[PDB]
Amino acid sequence: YEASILTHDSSIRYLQEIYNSNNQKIVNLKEKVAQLEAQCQEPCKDTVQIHDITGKDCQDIANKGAKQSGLYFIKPLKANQQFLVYCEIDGSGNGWTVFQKRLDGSVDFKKNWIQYKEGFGHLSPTGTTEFWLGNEKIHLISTQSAIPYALRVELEDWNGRTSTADYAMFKVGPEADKYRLTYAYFAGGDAGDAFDGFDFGDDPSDKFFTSHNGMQFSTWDNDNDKFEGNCAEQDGSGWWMNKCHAGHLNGVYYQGGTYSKASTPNGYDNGIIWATWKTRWYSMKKTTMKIIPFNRLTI
Amino acid sequence: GHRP
Amino acid sequence: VIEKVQHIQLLQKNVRAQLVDMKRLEVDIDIKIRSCRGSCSRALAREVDLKDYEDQQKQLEQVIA
Amino acid sequence: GPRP
Amino acid sequence: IPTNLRVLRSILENLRSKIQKLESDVSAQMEYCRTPCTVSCNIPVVSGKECEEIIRKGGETSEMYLIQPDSSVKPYRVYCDMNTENGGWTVIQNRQDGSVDFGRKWDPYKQGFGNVATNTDGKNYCGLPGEYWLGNDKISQLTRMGPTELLIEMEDWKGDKVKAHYGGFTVQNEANKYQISVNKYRGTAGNALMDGASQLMGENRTMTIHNGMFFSTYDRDNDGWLTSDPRKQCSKEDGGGWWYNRCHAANPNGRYYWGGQYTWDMAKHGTDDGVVWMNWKGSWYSMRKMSMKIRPFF
Ligand SMILES: *[C@@H]1O[C@H](CO[C@@H]2O[C@@H](C)[C@@H](O)[C@@H](O)[C@@H]2O)[C@@H](O[C@@H]2O[C@H](CO)[C@@H](O)[C@H](O)[C@H]2NC(C)=O)[C@H](O)[C@H]1NC(C)=O
Ligand SMILES: [Ca+2]
Ligand SMILES: [Ca+2]
């Protein structure tokens, strides 16, 4: 209401007090702001981590002490540079180098030559993602000076059953020879030797024309199969085609397992099939192709 | 900016 | 220039300095807190309003005259 | 995939 | 003295309360900072010396990739832009929110800092870039591998975009104070690196050219500002590590001001720190988005 001139003397000092107090609090706040800063420099912690141990392949790593399955860097002898791979290390010192993985249809496998050559998909530290490691790498890993390799295929239907198929002296050629697939023989497997062809019952040569040992890798943009048509193209995949296939792991992902000639764009069976274990109209739920030094596979 |  | 009039002049230059000073800490803190979003679990959601600071700044000067 |  | 003591009390009490709000807001942040943010970036299979090789190897999606410029150092994560202008762009600097602090010392600027990428929501891979500075040693090495062009992109808080290309971009090693060199400019954001601050004349505009400058950080003065006051360094004021001259036309690594518009009485040292690029919005506008990406020339 406009106090007396005698109020001024006191009222004026009341400001000086809260003003100075304010100042102090500001000095202490700037301090705290300084400490908060040392708290906000780190980046978010990434769950996916790559291990330190490296070798010529997963088995080398598994033999250097590696113990848990995960992402590692490997570098085969003749490899120009190292590359990230997925290693499966069981409790017996076995280290598998996985190069193909299907499990949900997340990744499209209708890729071109180069893509199948360099690889595609994603490597996850828990083997829960689909991918194609890459023909070139597969070649390097399976052709290291005097080291017989073995290939294991693991199937899993939409019921819960899981079967395997093994191949001794597995190998993939250089690009010069279209990464040709070859092996010494079927090493057994309750999944069946679908690499030896299948008597589909549509002709006398079905066996021969659907066998894979010796086949070169083929893609829509690079046909190297034994068929005037384009296997890789009509079946929308990248694979060691003949005319065309008994096994088709990089095939179209069909949810459920059962698909009809109508489901396909061009009648022919183009799913993830393996003739010696299921019908040509049954696509697998989980697919996995891994290799390891042969001598390592049960002596 | 500049520091003339 | 009187006994108190000199005091009141210093409290003007002081609150004017503190009014601009604070107006800054308010911005500094807004940036510093947001810059924690890429480190910490979360960043306290907030919004600055320089209006109140500007309103008072123009408000002070009016009386300082 | 036995092509005719 | 009449209604004067009246106002002076009102403002001081207001500030008092405002100090209570900030003390309060800073306490919360401190607690939330007792635990980190997190990401889960499954690494893509295809890799290469850099993004250009990856795109050529068939990596056609913009996400985080692992690249190895050379057998020397171990592979490191980077964000690849495979969509802007034929892709193959390796992001070396990114700004989009104010999540990461850029006012760091020399070492963090040398090793790199920030988040390279974050999860795309519901996805196992990180297809979104975060805010980050790749690292000086890394940037220098990429440029010296061969001719490198530089693409700088930006956007205001309203959505307008402008780019600043450079046919030649190089960064010398640490021994040479990461000296920067660019040329063959073009684009719509204005050549702020070579020519200098567009709105300045003669001598003034020159002291704002970055080309040829050395990299400086608030704890390592290599600016084109010859002075004696230990507080008059372009990195201490303007905040953030950059190829400051005297002081800048472009402040890509400046303070991220929300809203864009900002003024001298908001700035810490009253300077024009803030994601600025004068040649387009002037000295008092902080871009909403700011990024620097490289790619082999040809
Ligand atoms: C170079 O800039 C300086 C700094 O002044 C600031 O920047 C100017 C571009 C302009 O925007 C000013 O309003 C800013 O304050 C100029 O400073 C001159 O300094 C002298 C000596 O103190 C003074 O007498 C002048 O009036 C100032 N500038 C003028 C003529 O208005 C300087 O003049 C600028 N010179 C050039 C190269 O343009
Ligand atoms: Ca053919
Ligand atoms: Ca200096």
Q: For C51, phi and psi rounded to 5 degrees?
A: -50, -50
∠ at Cα E72 (E66, E75), nearest 5°? 10
Residue type, A135: N
β partners of residue E261: E285
The residue assigned the tokens 């499966």 is A88
- The two beta strands, E63-67 and E117-118, are unpaired
On the CB side of E297, CA atoms within 13 Å amount to 17
List the end-to-end C-alpha distance of chain C, in Å, as a whole number: 15
Question: How is residue A281 written in tokens?
Answer: 């109209």
E1-41 in CATH: which number? 1.20.5.50
- Domain E190-288 belongs in CATH node 1.10.3720.10: no
- Give residue E273's Cα distance to chain centre: 12
The ranges of chain E annotated as CATH 1.20.5.50 are 1-41
| Rounded Cα–Cα distance for residues A144 and A214 (Å) | 19
Q: Which residue has the tokens 């290309």?
A: E165
Cα(A116)–Cα(A137) distance, rounded to whole angstroms? 11
Task: Give residue limits of the domains in chain A.
Answer: 1-48, 49-191+286-296, 192-285
Domain E42-189+289-298 has CATH 3.90.215.10: yes
Is the CB of residue E197 less than 8 Å away from at least one CB of chain B? yes
Distances (CA, A) of A274 to A159, A164, A242, E14, E102: 16, 11, 15, 77, 55
Domain limits at C32? 1-65
E runs forming strands in chain A: 45-46, 70-74, 83-89, 95-102, 120-123, 131-132, 149-156, 162-172, 181-182, 185-188, 286-293
Evaluate the CA torsion angle E266, E268, E273, E275 in order and state its sign. negative
Q: How far is CA E241 from CA E105, E113, E135, E136, E244, in A?
A: 8, 12, 11, 10, 8
Tell me whether residues E204 and B1 touch, CB distance under 8 A.
no
- Resolution value, angstrom units: 2.8
**Tokens linked to A176:** 């010069």
Residues, chain A, total?
299
Quote the minimal CA–CA distance from A42 to chain C in Å.
5
Residue given tokens 């009490």 in the structure block: E13
Tell me which fold the domain A1-48 belongs to: 1.20.5
Hey, what CATH topology would domain A192-285 get?
Gamma-fibrinogen Carboxyl Terminal Fragment; domain 2 (4.10.530)
Report the structure determination method. X-ray
**Closest to A158 measured CA to CA, from A249, A6, A285:** A285
- Cβ–Cβ under 8 Å, residues A48 and A67: no
Number of domains in chain C: 1
Does A157 appear as a known binding residue?
no
- Chains C and D touching, counted as 3 or more CB pairs less than 8 Å apart: no
Is the Cβ–Cβ distance between A58 and A133 less than 8 Å? no
Q: Is A114 helix (H, G, I), strand (E, B) or coil?
A: helix
* A229 marked among binding-site residues: yes
> A23: which chain C residues are within 8 Å (Cβ-Cβ)?
18
May I ask the CATH architecture of the domain A49-191+286-296?
Alpha-Beta Complex (3.90)
CATH number assigned to the domain comprising residue C54: 1.20.5.50
Q: Cβ(A139)–Cβ(A173) under 8 Å?
A: yes
Q: What angle do CA A254, E45, E78 make, to 5 degrees?
A: 130
Sign of CA dihedral A211, A213, A215, A219: positive
- 3-state SS assignment for residue A141: helix
Query: Do chains B and E touch by CB distance (3+ pairs < 8 Å)?
Result: yes
Inter-chain CB proximity C38 and E266 less than 8 Å: no
Q: Is the dihedral of CA C18, C22, C25, C31 positive or negative?
A: negative
Ranges for all domains in chain E classified under CATH 4.10.530.10: 190-288
Taking the C-alpha atoms of residue E131 and residue E216, their distance in angstroms, rounded to an integer, is 20
Tokens, residue E162:
């402008």
How far apart are the two ends of chain D, measured CA to CA in Å? Answer: 9
Cis ω for the linkage preceding A58 (within 30 of 0): no
Cβ contact E8–C30 (<8 Å): no
| Cβ within 8 Å of A, E 88-147 | 100-101, 104, 108, 113-116, 118, 124-125, 130, 132
The Cα–Cα gap between E272 and E247 comes to 10
CA atoms within 13 A on the CB side of A93: 9
Asked whether E286 and E276 are in contact (CB, 8 A), the reply is yes
Q: Is E204 in the pocket of ligand 1 (CB under 6 A)?
A: yes
Residue E96 and residue E85: Cα distance in Å, rounded?
A: 20
Residue linked to tokens 């070649």 = A139
Tokens of C7: 């005091």
Number of DSSP helices (H) and strands (E) in chain D, helices first: 0, 0
**HEC string for chain E:** CHHHHHHHHHHHHHHHHHHHHHHHHHHHHHHHCCCECEECCCEECCCECCHHHHHHCCCCCCEEEEECCCCCCCCEEEEEECCHHHCCEEEEEEECCCCCCCCCCHHHHHHCEECCEECCCCCCCCCEECCEECCHHHHHHHHCCCCEEEEEEEECCCCCEEEEEEEEEEECCHHHCCCEEEEEEEECCCCCCCCCCCCCCHHHHHCCCCCCCCCEECCECCCCCCCCCCCCCCCCCCCCCECCCCECCEECCCCCCCCCECCCCCCCCCCCCCCEEHHHHECCECCCEEEEEEEECC
E199 Cα distance to chain centroid = 22
Q: Are E254 and E104 in contact (CB under 8 A)?
A: no
Contact E196, E249 (CB under 8 A): yes
